[PDB]
Amino acid sequence: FLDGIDKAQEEHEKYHSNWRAMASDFNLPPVVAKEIVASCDKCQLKGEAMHGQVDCSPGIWQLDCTHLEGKVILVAVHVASGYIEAEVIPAETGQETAYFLLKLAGRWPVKTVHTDNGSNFTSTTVKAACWWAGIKQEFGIPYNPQSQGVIESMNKELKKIIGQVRDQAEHLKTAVQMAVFIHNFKRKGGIGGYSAGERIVDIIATDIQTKELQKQITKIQNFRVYYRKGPAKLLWKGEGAVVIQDNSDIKVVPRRKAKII
Amino acid sequence: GYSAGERIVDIIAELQKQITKIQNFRVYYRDSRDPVWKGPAK
Amino acid sequence: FLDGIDKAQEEHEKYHSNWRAMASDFNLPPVVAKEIVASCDKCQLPGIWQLDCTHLEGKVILVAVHVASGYIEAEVIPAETGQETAYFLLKLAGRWPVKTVHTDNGSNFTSTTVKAACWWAGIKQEFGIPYNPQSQGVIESMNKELKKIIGQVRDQAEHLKTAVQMAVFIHNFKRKGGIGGYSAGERIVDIIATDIQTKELQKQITKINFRVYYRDSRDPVWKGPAKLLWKGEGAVVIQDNSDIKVVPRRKAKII
Amino acid sequence: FLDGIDKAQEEHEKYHSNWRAMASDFNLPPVVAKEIVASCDKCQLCSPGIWQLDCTHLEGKVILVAVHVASGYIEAEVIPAETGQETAYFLLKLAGRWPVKTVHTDNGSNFTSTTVKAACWWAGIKQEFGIPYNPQSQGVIESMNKELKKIIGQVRDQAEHLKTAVQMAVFIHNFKRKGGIGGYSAGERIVDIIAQKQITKIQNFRVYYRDSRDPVWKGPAKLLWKGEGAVVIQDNSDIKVVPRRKAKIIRD
DNA sequence: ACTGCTAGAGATTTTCCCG
DNA sequence: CGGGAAAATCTCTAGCA
DNA sequence: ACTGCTAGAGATTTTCCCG
DNA sequence: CGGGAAAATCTCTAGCA
Ligand SMILES: [Mg+2]
Ligand SMILES: [Mg+2]
Numbered sequence A: 001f002l003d004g005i006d007k008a009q010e011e012h013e014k015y016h017s018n019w020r021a022m023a024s025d026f027n028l029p030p031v032v033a034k035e036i037v038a039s040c041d042k043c044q045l046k047g048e049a050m051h052g053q054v055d056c057s058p059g060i061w062q063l064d065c066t067h068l069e070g071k072v073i074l075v076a077v078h079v080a081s082g083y084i085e086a087e088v089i090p091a092e093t094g095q096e097t098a099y100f101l102l103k104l105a106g107r108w109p110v111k112t113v114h115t116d117n118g119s120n121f122t123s124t125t126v127k128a129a130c131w132w133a134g135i136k137q138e139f140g141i142p143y144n145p146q147s148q149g150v151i152e153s154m155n156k157e158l159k160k161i162i163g164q165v166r167d168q169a170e171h172l173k174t175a176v177q178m179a180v181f182i183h184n185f186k187r188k189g190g191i192g193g194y195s196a197g198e199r200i201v202d203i204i205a206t207d208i209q210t211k212e213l214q215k216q217i218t219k220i221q222n223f224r225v226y227y228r229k230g231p232a233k234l235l236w237k238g239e240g241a242v243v244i245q246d247n248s249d250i251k252v253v254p255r256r257k258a259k260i261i
Numbered sequence B: 001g002y003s004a005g006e007r008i009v010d011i012i013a014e015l016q017k018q019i020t021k022i023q024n025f026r027v028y029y030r031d032s033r034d035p036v037w038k039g040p041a042k
Numbered sequence C: 001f002l003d004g005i006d007k008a009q010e011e012h013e014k015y016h017s018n019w020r021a022m023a024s025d026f027n028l029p030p031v032v033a034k035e036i037v038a039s040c041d042k043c044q045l046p047g048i049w050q051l052d053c054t055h056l057e058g059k060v061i062l063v064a065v066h067v068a069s070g071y072i073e074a075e076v077i078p079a080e081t082g083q084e085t086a087y088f089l090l091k092l093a094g095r096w097p098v099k100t101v102h103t104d105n106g107s108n109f110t111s112t113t114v115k116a117a118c119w120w121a122g123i124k125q126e127f128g129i130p131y132n133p134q135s136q137g138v139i140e141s142m143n144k145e146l147k148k149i150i151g152q153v154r155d156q157a158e159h160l161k162t163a164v165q166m167a168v169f170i171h172n173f174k175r176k177g178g179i180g181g182y183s184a185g186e187r188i189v190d191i192i193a194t195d196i197q198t199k200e201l202q203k204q205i206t207k208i209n210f211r212v213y214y215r216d217s218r219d220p221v222w223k224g225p226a227k228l229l230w231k232g233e234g235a236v237v238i239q240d241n242s243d244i245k246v247v248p249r250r251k252a253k254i255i
Numbered sequence D: 001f002l003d004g005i006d007k008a009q010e011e012h013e014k015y016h017s018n019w020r021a022m023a024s025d026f027n028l029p030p031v032v033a034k035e036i037v038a039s040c041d042k043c044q045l046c047s048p049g050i051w052q053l054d055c056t057h058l059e060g061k062v063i064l065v066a067v068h069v070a071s072g073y074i075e076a077e078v079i080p081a082e083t084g085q086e087t088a089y090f091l092l093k094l095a096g097r098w099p100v101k102t103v104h105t106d107n108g109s110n111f112t113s114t115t116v117k118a119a120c121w122w123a124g125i126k127q128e129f130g131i132p133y134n135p136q137s138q139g140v141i142e143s144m145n146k147e148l149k150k151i152i153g154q155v156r157d158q159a160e161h162l163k164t165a166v167q168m169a170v171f172i173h174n175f176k177r178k179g180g181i182g183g184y185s186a187g188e189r190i191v192d193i194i195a196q197k198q199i200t201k202i203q204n205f206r207v208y209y210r211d212s213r214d215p216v217w218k219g220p221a222k223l224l225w226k227g228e229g230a231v232v233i234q235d236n237s238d239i240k241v242v243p244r245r246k247a248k249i250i251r252d
Numbered sequence E, G: 001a002c003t004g005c006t007a008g009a010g011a012t013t014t015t016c017c018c019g
Numbered sequence F, H: 001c002g003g004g005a006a007a008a009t010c011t012c013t014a015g016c017a
Helices: A003-015 A019-025 A030-039 A092-105 A126-133 A146-166 A171-187 A196-220 B004-012 B015-023 C001-013 C030-037 C084-093 C112-121 C133-153 C160-174 C184-206 D001-015 D030-039 D085-094 D113-124 D137-158 D162-176 D188-194 D196-203
Strands: A061-067 A071-078 A084-089 A112-115 A136-139 A224-226 A232-237 A241-245 A250-256 A259-261 B025-030 B036-042 C048-054 C060-066 C071-077 C098-103 C124-127 C210-214 C224-233 C236-238 C244-248 C252-254 D050-058 D061-068 D076-080 D102-104 D205-209 D217-226 D230-235 D238-243 D249-251
Touching: A003 A019, A003 A030, A003 D230, A019 A030, A019 B015, A061 D137, A071 A092, A071 A146, A084 A092, A084 A146, A084 A171, A092 A126, A112 A146, A112 B036, A112 D137, A126 A136, A146 A171, A171 A196, A196 B015, B036 C160, C001 C030, C030 C071, C030 C184, C048 C084, C048 C112, C048 C133, C060 C084, C060 C133, C071 C084, C071 C133, C071 C160, C071 C184, C071 D030, C084 C112, C084 D162, C112 C124, C160 C184, C184 D050, C184 D188, C210 C236, C210 C244, C224 C252, C236 C252, D001 D030, D001 D162, D050 D137, D050 D238, D061 D137, D061 D162, D076 D162, D085 D113, D137 D188, D162 D188
Parallel strands: A061 A112, A112 A136, C048 C098, C098 C124, D050 D102
Antiparallel strands: A061 A071, A071 A084, A224 A259, A232 A241, A241 A250, B025 B036, C048 C060, C060 C071, C210 C224, C210 C252, C224 C236, C236 C244, D050 D061, D061 D076, D205 D217, D205 D249, D217 D230, D230 D238
């Protein structure tokens, strides 16, 4: 292929032909043509085809403003449940945002808030509010709304319901509260056939109850598993398996080659 | 040198109840490369 | 860098020495130390060897020394012509992985044959006075000690060349001393095994290479290559000319 | 090709090895290496301290070859004549490069010569004549002889005198041919194989005696053990322990 | 070092109910 | 065990940024 | 009575080649 | 019939409007 490699490179600096073109024309193994393309800086123009996944921890909220009929609507969503909070604010200011976030934190457990990099969420007043209530702030990558896919999807859902009930109310703020009500309690679906209100209550109660249950379980139950190794702490056992926490690492081991002390 | 109360309280301070309780909860989850949520797991 | 390497850099700023400390005491790979001394404006500066000559008893003796361990490779050469020095340098290069050689500018080393020897084997050579001629003084003192050795051994060898070799071996192995009384062989072997492990360590250090091409934010144009720093699920962190950026994996390409 | 691949090809022309270097060191894909070796006309495709020695002839010239059993690291040099004295000189030159301990020969007259025994003595090298008593090196010595002959068969086009071609082949077989277990060139493996010193390091270690009161007495102790948060040192006629904060260790 | 999601419309497969 | 209908699960899109 | 598609990057499965 | 690598097929995205 020594002859063809030099020619395909010259043709690539003119044409930037993809690897199949070089492999067909200059009789090349697919790996060599691919290497020619790969080392071209002008031919690197496409990302990888995948999507990430947002954090859906029980304490994470996603926030964003949305605009409707010239007014600013500050919308928050609890990621795990789909529950929502929303108000019309007078302006997209850091002060209005600090106030909204303080109200949210005083009504619901809020461990982390995830927003874009708009001026209102990045402001020092919002920081001071988040420091006071103990809220971690996660800032999305700039110009990447998929980072806040949940609240963007929920802003669509809320705009649709506001459109549905707009002529039942004079002012926009009231339509926003009617739509919030409707979404939280008058729309069922999702993981447990729930409405979002039912679902957030279940998520938060489940968090509380499982925390308590397993804390008591670990207080009373005390063992040490040796597998394969060191004194691994026991997490669970059953059906020919054991769960252990060895140096902050959780691994599923079969019952064989595993002895409990 | 412990009072009868101290020994009583220590003694009184089962697990299968709490374990079945924990095993009653449903878990919906995803694998790190699949957008669809996986059905209720135990 | 690592906290140890940052501490070594701060110790350099405190003490104006780069290679003599972090390459030895801090176990830094030689490539990083070379990069640091290159960046260091205060630093004007296992594969190092030196070659020299001596004229004991009217005969020409050419001696090589591994600087880091007091090893000896020597041979009585029939003549000072560069042709025979080329053959002997071929021997040194074949027997051990020799990377750089420090000699003088003389025609005994600048001849065409020596240049061909370096070209074939892959050895770099220095011609002239080294920046630290105290090493040359040390090897000359070793030459004098070999000469005293010879003044003793020549009671045992019918041919002075053979006594030259006998001395080479005595100093390699029997004359153990320094630090903890170690022979030149022991230090040589330790150094070269450490060198193998440092090649492996340099590989694993440089692992954590990757060119990243990425779509910048709001920009239609793709840019790169950037250095990859960290790779999560969904996003990466990239170094594009001392400018740390975070890019979703949809908008990046890692080669 | 890439600058690295072109450099690898030039290194092949310099060293007559294709797969053992670019497939391993240069991370070349196996298909490209296979294509290169196909195009390459020159590519036809125990007890450490135990070495073999042997005599070979080529084009009317005599070559003495030293091998290592434990990794096939091969030393060699052209000999002026088959006489025993030259053999003794070569074995001498061997002694100073590695701790040779026992060698095996073919019981030849030039090797049974007395001077060979003399050299083996004053250097401290033992001779175990006959054939080696392990059923690996017995054919391995001849196999590596054939390997050296084959390497010279390609080297000879770049050297008109055997005295240089032999060293060319030796460097190739020592480093530029990497294989075996994981692709380790013989030189690397022998580095590993070669790798009382630590005992002699601490023989003369005396200690300035102190105690938990943190005194400045600095008694004439002898260091017995170090580590695990304290020391173990003898105090004249008795034994005690001292934390590392005290008990300075010095040479006697 | 961070990350698309949600809800509805129609298609497909599974389950349950009388045999 | 067999259909047939009712329920549950699957595929796929717009629209939010 | 008209209508999403294309090309590349990485993952997964299939096929072929020496055994 | 078995691996292992090389080739072919599959999944999925941006960007065009
Ligand atoms: Mg926004
Ligand atoms: Mg918005």
